[PDB]
Write an enzyme that holds these catalytic residues in place. Structure first.
Site, short mmCIF file in Angstrom:
data_model
loop_
_atom_site.label_atom_id
_atom_site.label_comp_id
_atom_site.label_asym_id
_atom_site.label_seq_id
_atom_site.Cartn_x
_atom_site.Cartn_y
_atom_site.Cartn_z
N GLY A 1 0.76 -1.24 0.00
CA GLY A 1 0.00 0.00 0.00
C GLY A 1 0.80 1.30 0.00
N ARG B 1 13.66 9.41 -1.92
CA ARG B 1 14.60 10.51 -2.03
C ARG B 1 15.91 10.17 -1.33
NH1 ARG B 1 16.35 14.58 1.57
NH2 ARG B 1 17.04 16.49 0.48
N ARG C 1 0.11 -4.85 -7.09
CA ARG C 1 0.19 -6.27 -6.73
C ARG C 1 0.86 -7.06 -7.85
NH1 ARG C 1 -4.20 -4.74 -7.61
NH2 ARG C 1 -5.40 -3.29 -6.29
N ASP D 1 3.10 -5.42 3.66
CA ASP D 1 2.37 -6.56 3.12
C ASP D 1 3.33 -7.56 2.49
OD1 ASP D 1 0.09 -4.13 2.25
OD2 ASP D 1 -0.49 -5.86 3.51
N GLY D 2 4.26 -8.09 3.29
CA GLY D 2 5.22 -9.02 2.76
C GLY D 2 5.59 -8.60 1.35
N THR E 1 4.22 1.43 5.66
CA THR E 1 2.78 1.27 5.79
C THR E 1 2.29 2.29 6.80
OG1 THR E 1 0.98 -0.21 6.57
CG2 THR E 1 3.19 -0.65 7.39
N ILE E 2 0.98 2.50 6.85
CA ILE E 2 0.41 3.40 7.83
C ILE E 2 0.07 2.65 9.12
CG2 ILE E 2 -0.51 5.10 6.22
CD1 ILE E 2 -3.27 3.59 6.68
N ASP E 3 -0.05 1.33 9.04
CA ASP E 3 -0.62 0.57 10.15
C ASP E 3 0.40 -0.05 11.12
OD1 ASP E 3 0.14 -1.88 9.01
OD2 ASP E 3 -1.80 -2.14 8.01
N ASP F 1 2.20 -2.38 11.16
CA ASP F 1 2.28 -3.83 11.15
C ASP F 1 3.40 -4.35 10.24
OD1 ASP F 1 1.85 -6.53 11.33
OD2 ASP F 1 -0.30 -6.45 10.96
N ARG G 1 -24.15 13.89 21.05
CA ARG G 1 -24.30 12.63 20.35
C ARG G 1 -23.08 11.76 20.56
NH1 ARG G 1 -26.25 15.65 14.77
NH2 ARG G 1 -28.50 15.30 15.08
N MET H 1 -8.46 2.64 10.20
CA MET H 1 -7.77 1.55 9.53
C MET H 1 -6.87 0.75 10.50
SD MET H 1 -7.28 3.06 5.57
CE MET H 1 -6.32 1.68 4.96
N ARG I 1 -5.88 -3.23 9.52
CA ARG I 1 -6.53 -4.46 9.09
C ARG I 1 -6.34 -5.58 10.09
N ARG J 1 -24.16 8.35 15.69
CA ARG J 1 -23.66 8.40 14.32
C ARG J 1 -22.44 7.50 14.15
NH1 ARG J 1 -28.44 9.66 13.91
NH2 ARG J 1 -28.97 11.75 14.70
N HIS K 1 -9.86 5.66 3.30
CA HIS K 1 -8.57 5.86 2.65
C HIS K 1 -7.93 7.23 2.77
CE1 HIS K 1 -7.90 2.02 0.06
NE2 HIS K 1 -8.22 1.74 1.31
#
Ligand SMILES: [Ca+2]
Ligand SMILES: [Ca+2]
Ligand SMILES: [Ca+2]
Ligand SMILES: [Ca+2]
Ligand SMILES: [Ca+2]
Lengths: 319, 319, 318, 319
Positions: free
Chosen positions: A11, A21, A72, A103-104, A125-127, A129, A162, A169, A171, A243, A249
């Protein structure tokens, strides 16, 4: 080496450009050339290769996404493809590859290395992981995106008394949820690495309605479930109008934060140092505020974790 | 007048606080007291009224949401209600009322006047459809929120050669989708105020795919349909990987931009002047870069429209 | 027409590339080619010129600065210089020219039209100091830059019960100062178009101090004087801990706001339309929320003015 | 302990409020009362002390500055001033103090501990210049203010082909400068922790211009000198067109980044823990991505350093 290649896979992530850079500016400092491979491993099989010049990386450090693109590639899962990639690399006289991503996109760095092509992974990645590092490139920026959303949704939440479920995100990793929810004063945070009891969430909420609280925010990692179902469970159970918001994304884009730029410049430069001194099949990262490198083989085995004292903290800070 | 009141009804909107601040500080300049009514008309019925002091508007010009809160009131649609509400007004010796918001809410300002309480409405909503004004308080801010979002998704869209459908707010008005999709370079914008044809949309996308554009982004007003649906229609047609994003209520919150802060300070002050000049049942607004006040009764009958020449512009600039 | 050009002159401005993007996509709509001239008028004289493809207009809609660059050109202020301008114009078959900028970009648009060459001008400056329009491309983005800063300075001033003076850009116009200070809840604004009395300001801050107000932001337009000086007169006068911030060229940069991106898109598109209709020697703008175009020579003739009521409003709200 | 106090001293810093929120909510988790001490040390001496209630922290996590204010206090280094400090403390039943602030504040926290009164110190400053921690609360936010400014000055400098000098804050620390410069892509960074040679600066500047580069950013930590000078110097050295931006106090303000909010929240909570475990005289921090505490006297002994290898990297990356 004299010539090396760089590539992004998995991703999109804010800072990859700063990473890219860095790979280039550094190699240059050492009289080495860099060739950009486009569209990730797909681009590698395909021969999508073009020398990068000192000027192709000027003024991109602030720029989200990846200029080299990413896609991919089922073919790279087979000996067949791995083979063709090295041909194309060998064709351009590329003796070393910096793979930037998640992601490998490491599997390939590994596979490549096992076929005797020197390969180094940079965490993208952003996550958060990816193993081998405490933080990944893009996580800091992604967080400020989430809490900027949290800041805004609190404005309405407060105005209208409320309760909001915001689905973030992550996963598999609850990193984003943990960290952002901590930073947004989120009064409920639901992650994959930590049990939760929905009956507990419901009661806590009811309990605050009493103690003067009319608004509330519930961060939920996508890896736990769909915000939509969670909100349903809550309004149906409390009568409070509730709500739901799925940030999706937006999280993946944006100008990389100062942390993400520095980290990307450091890591990416380390990765080059490793290639040049003969190493390969390694992945760099930052651990305990120190630069580290590891064997991908070894690193891919380390199950991911979140700091549980922090999850604890956030529960305490939010009774 | 010596004492007046202020209140915010309908949906939340960035800049309302700037309006409230201005309503208050203007009144002070003229030696008039100002009382806050909390929780919209529901508050008015209820008696939630407290004098505001200079120090209660000491921030708050930069803060999103509304410090007076806001809430729905079925009861206020019935006569017995406004009655009850006027009682409360009289009980605190309030001689006039500024009503800031959509949506609306001008209805109540109207019926209030009819019942002999002097009442002035101020245009507060993000979606931009309150008559009597080219622009409503909150619009500019929301637009910059949506384009920040459009910018970020363009970052990921570009790296992955992917096509995004982004669903924006404006339940009946295409203003947001129009203005932001223009500012965001969106190649497709769908609004309630103009015909669209999905066959045209689809063809257009296939056309660019060839031309060399691998990423595209469709902007869609919720008032037209569900993004998580248009997206399906597109990819269940063209072979393109299509992602969907509903930004939802992030749009409602945030620190109001300069335009919104200035607009709010102006409309607010104008609204107070009307009340003091003895006028009532009016609503202020900006029209052709000049401030105007109209009879609410008339304003409420003008169908909302969008600049069709701009929609057109966005088409030409897009093919 | 089958071929026009576009350039950017004077101080760069956020949303120019929006204006440029628009000029180029718009021409492509009508089957017209656009040639870019780089480095403003210096580039026109030197014939720095290259076909813009579809291509190079991005997306660049969010990008600040100007992909065509910009640079001063004393030479173009003279007969022979313009002769070279046209020579180069013709050498490329460029039949018309869109000029984007301020501070005398218009001057060249006129002269060039006078020598029988069709030119449209587009208002591009942060200071809003261009006739024929209410708002120039770059103003909104600049204002939001200024209030972000004011917001941040309000954070620190509040914590420390201090009084700051913030010097904002503008040159000869006080638009920025008046619009930002008003948006930032400033308690003093000083601009070229209105008159002030320092003794007034002083006492007005001494007074607010009486009612318990522990912090103040004075906003000063550079066109009125140096922020540093005002800070000094004030601190000597009252004894209060007084700091001063000169934001400088921060105001010039950044990704253009929704208003600036839209204004640029409209204005630029309208500018090319004019050339295509055989019109020339005109500058586009927005006035009373309507798209307008005026003869340059006569637009350049109006002294610029601020909204006096708004300044008055800003006082009453203090 | 059933009751503690919290205070903020030194320069203000984005995230102090997050740090306060944590001090005050963590204590509630443990049934401890928190008393706010307003205006830092001058307040402590004069009383000016009020119970912090839940509501007083329920909406400050996102806010810059300190809701407790901060002021200098010459009195508090004397013996009598301190005598006065403790009396006032004892007068409210405050058994312990959390000091959130910058460096000088640690001084008083020790003096109190010496005189039999438990204090914990929390790193609060934008310039990172506080021992017992890798980063201080405020740094990240300041960096990001700086890089956004740098980003914006890149736009104008690139369209005009100008060279820029940007003076950034940090009295005796080059942390902001070094870090933002790296993050920003500075061609030149000047800081107090590392020798520079002006001539190598000019030369490095000329080599780059001959190699095609038409614009250049130069970052100077205010501790090295005045931006206006380095501006004059290199202008008349190179002849290039050169401009000078002094950001000044903007760096001090703003909503705290995700990192600063998280750091503030962990550190503050940890500080409460210490006082509650009877561990006075300490200062909390993050070191090597781990929460730590150190004797104040000892931490105050460590001359502050920057990461030389990082300064090295910034040079290699801008050849
Ligand atoms: Ca970007
Ligand atoms: Ca903005
Ligand atoms: Ca930019
Ligand atoms: Ca703030
Ligand atoms: Ca940790």
């Amino acid at each position: 080496m004299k010539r090396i290649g760089v590539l992004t896979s998995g991703g999109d992530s804010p800072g990859m450009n700063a990473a890219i850079r860095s790979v280039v500016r550094k190699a240059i400092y050492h009289g080495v050339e860099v060739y950009g491979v486009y569209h990730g491993y797909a681009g590698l099989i395909a021969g999508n290769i073009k020398k990068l010049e000192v000027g192709d990386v000027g003024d991109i450090i602030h720029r989200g996404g990846t200029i080299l693109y990413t896609a991919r590639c089922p073919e790279f899962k087979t000996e067949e493809g791995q083979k063709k990639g090295i041909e194309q690399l060998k064709k351009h006289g590329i003796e070393g590859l910096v793979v930037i991503g998640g992601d490998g996109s490491y599997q390939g760095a590994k596979k490549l290395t096992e076929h005797g092509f020197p390969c180094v992974g940079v965490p993208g990645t952003i996550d958060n992981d990816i193993p081998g590092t405490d933080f990944t490139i893009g996580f800091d920026t992604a967080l400020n995106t989430v809490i900027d959303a949290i800041d805004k949704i609190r404005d309405t939440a407060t105005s209208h008394e409320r309760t909001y479920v915001i689905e973030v995100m992550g996963r598999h990793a609850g990193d984003i949820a943990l960290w952002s929810g901590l930073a947004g004063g989120a009064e409920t945070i639901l992650i994959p690495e930590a049990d939760y009891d929905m009956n507990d969430v419901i009661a806590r909420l009811k309990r605050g309605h009493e103690r003067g609280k009319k608004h509330s925010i519930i961060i939920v990692a996508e890896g736990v479930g769909s915000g939509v179902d969670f909100g349903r469970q809550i309004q149906e159970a409390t009568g409070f109008e509730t709500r739901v918001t799925v940030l999706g994304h937006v999280q993946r884009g944006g100008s990389p934060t100062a942390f993400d730029r520095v980290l990307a410049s450091r890591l990416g430069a380390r990765a080059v140092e490793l290639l040049l001194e003969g190493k390969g099949g390694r992945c760099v990262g930052i651990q305990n505020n120190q630069l580290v490198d590891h064997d991908i083989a070894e690193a891919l085995a380390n199950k991911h974790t979140i700091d549980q004292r922090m999850y604890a903290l956030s529960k305490e800070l939010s009774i």
